[PDB]
Amino acid sequence: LFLF
């Protein structure tokens, strides 16, 4: 989630 950074970006996953």
Short mmCIF file of N, CA and C in Angstrom, two decimals:
data_model
loop_
_atom_site.label_atom_id
_atom_site.label_comp_id
_atom_site.label_asym_id
_atom_site.label_seq_id
_atom_site.Cartn_x
_atom_site.Cartn_y
_atom_site.Cartn_z
N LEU A 1 0.80 -1.24 0.00
CA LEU A 1 0.00 0.00 0.00
C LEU A 1 0.84 1.30 0.00
N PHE A 2 2.14 1.17 -0.33
CA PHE A 2 2.98 2.31 -0.68
C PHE A 2 3.59 2.05 -2.09
N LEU A 3 2.77 1.88 -3.15
CA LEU A 3 1.32 2.10 -3.15
C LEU A 3 0.50 0.80 -3.01
N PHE A 4 1.18 -0.34 -2.76
CA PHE A 4 0.50 -1.60 -2.47
C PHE A 4 0.89 -2.10 -1.05
#
